Amino acid sequence: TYFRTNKFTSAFQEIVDAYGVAKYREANPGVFTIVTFPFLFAVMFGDWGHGICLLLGTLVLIVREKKLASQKLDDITDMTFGGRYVILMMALFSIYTGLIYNEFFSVPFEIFSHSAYACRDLSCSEATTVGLIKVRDTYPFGVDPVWHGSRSELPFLNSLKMKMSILLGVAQMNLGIILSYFNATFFRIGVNIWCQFIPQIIFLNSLFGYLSLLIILKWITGSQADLYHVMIYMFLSPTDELGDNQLFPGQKTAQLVLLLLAFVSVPWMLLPKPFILKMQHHQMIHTIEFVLGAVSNTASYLRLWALSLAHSELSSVFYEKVLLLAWGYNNILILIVGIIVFIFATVGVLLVMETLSAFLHALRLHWVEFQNKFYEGDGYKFSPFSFALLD
């Protein structure tokens, strides 16, 4: 059986079908993914200019779908016709994503003030100074351009982006665990749910949450020299003792206790369910599956960070080419030729290549997250006696 799908729901249903099937009682996160995959893809990458233009083109296609119904699409156009709603939602999310990134039309733009971020004091001192720049005013709608888009601000900004992606992956894992718990409640197991899902969930969740809370505490304390590597430095010693950099006064003993708790819970993820089954009367796949899934979530976060960095680099390259064309063209013709060439190249790179790569990566991350979460394939589609030509 299949849940009824509207015009917008059809793409999510198709995605769920790609991720195998699920039982009628089995939870189907397809509706949730219909926003999550746009939510992740927006976090993954996005260009404000072409993305808005791509969204406008998709909306025009949706408006003209009446003719597109008559005019049979070809190859990827057919898939686009079905996925118009999902693409529009993804572009809408990417709009806010670019707003956060502040690279409007793949270029930083001032927000509210004449300059969104500036350098307080150091009037004569160069940007490469001890005082350097002070952001007395910070951009309220997006990252401060001085602190992010500037020449030397790139490394710290990238580290912060990677750290945030780690937290986003932790949140995705938590959502998967929550979905698993909900589906188990739907499965209505008297004690098997507590014996199996509760230990499999929560354990790795808190394992990653320790690092996420460490990141939050670092953001509160604002340590500088370690940059985003303070967490790496802290976790570098799984053994006890030391822990000088620990922001929480008791973070060391608490971390040791948490490590012991995780070590104890590790068999609890695998042992209770087969024991209950034997008492009534796979786990081997579940073995190492938790570590593999945590590694996969970290990989997804790193992939998102890398995709964002690559998008920023491509935007910088396009802006540099445009600036070079404009500055070195006293005559109108040279500037026009350069602008046209740069526009064509940037469109091809971003709207096609970068967009497809980001979509594929986001889809793969979504499949990994869903497979970790639930629904384990194992089903088929609703089978009516519908006339294919008529319907």
């Binding site: 059986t1 009628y24 609703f382 009516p384 006696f385 519908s386 006339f387 008529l390 319907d391």
Partner: peptide, 27 residues
């Protein structure tokens, strides 16, 4: 939220029901 169904329908009437359910149908 579906379930199996079983029925016995005369062939002559079954033709009309099948024709009606051809486009979309249930089972």
């Amino acid at each position: 939220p579906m379930q199996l169904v079983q029925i016995i329908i005369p062939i002559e009437s079954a033709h009309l029901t099948v024709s009606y359910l051809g486009e979309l149908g249930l089972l």
